[PDB]
A paper describes a structure:
The [name] protein of influenza virus is an important virulence factor and has been demonstrated to interact with a wide variety of viral and cellular biomolecules. The effector domain (ED) of the influenza virus virulence factor [name] is capable of interaction with a variety of cellular and viral targets, although regulation of these events is poorly understood. Furthermore, both domains form homodimers in vitro. While the conformation of the RBD dimer appears to be conserved, two forms of the ED dimer have been proposed: the strand–strand dimer and the helix–helix dimer.
In this paper, we report a third X-ray crystallographic structure of the PR8 [name] ED containing the [name] mutation. A new condition for crystallization of this protein [0.1 M Bis-Tris pH 6.0, 0.2 M NaCl, 22%(w/v) PEG 3350, 20 mM xylitol] was discovered using the hanging-drop vapour-diffusion method. Diffraction data extending to 1.8 Å resolution were collected from a crystal grown in the presence of 40 mM thieno[2,3-­b]pyridin-2-ylmethanol. The novel crystal form of PR8 [name] ED ([name]) shows the α/β fold common to all structures of [name] ED. The introduction of a [name] mutation into the ED induces a monomeric phenotype and, intriguingly, two crystal structures of the PR8 [name] ED containing this mutation also exhibit this strand–strand interface. However, it is intriguing to observe that the strand–strand dimer is conserved among all three PR8 [name] ED ([name]) structures that have now been solved. Therefore, since the PR8 [name] ED [name] mutant is monomeric in vitro, it appears highly likely that the helix–helix dimer is the predominant interface for ED homodimerization. The partial con­servation of the strand–strand packing interface indicates that while it may not allow ED dimerization, extension of the β-sheet is a possible method of interaction with cellular and viral binding partners.
Numbering used by the authors: 86 to 203
């Protein structure tokens, strides 16, 4: 069976959020959203991945959170749910990290993503 390993709580994954200054970029099979208003924060990237054979397979959802718990960024598969490679995920994360860091934020990633990184 396909299972799911996530850094996020049920509430964190379900929450609706608005960006103060919306930015949305599509990069291949993945959508990247980030709030252009956010600056000088410590941000943590948290992800939910499907798992098969005890290995991380596809990204279901990634959200970027301030330490206080506010969502400031998101990566999700396109609605067509095209399906993607690990390289697609790594590219989309780099794009999000780049944008956030350009706005003077400090970005770190979860243990789940660290592991995925290689």
């Amino acid at each position: 069976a396909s299972r799911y390993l996530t850094d996020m709580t049920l509430e964190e994954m379900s929450r609706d959020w608005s960006m103060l200054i919306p930015k949305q970029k599509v990069a291949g099979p993945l959508c990247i959203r980030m709030d252009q208003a956010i600056m000088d924060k410590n941000i943590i990237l948290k992800a939910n991945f499907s798992v098969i054979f005890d290995r991380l397979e596809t990204l279901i959802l990634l959200r970027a959170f301030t330490e206080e718990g506010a969502i400031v960024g998101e990566i999700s598969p396109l609605p067509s749910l095209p399906g993607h490679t690990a390289e697609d995920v790594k590219n989309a994360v780099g794009v999000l990290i780049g944008g956030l860091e350009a706005n003077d934020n400090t970005v770190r990633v979860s243990e789940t993503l660290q592991r995925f990184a290689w």
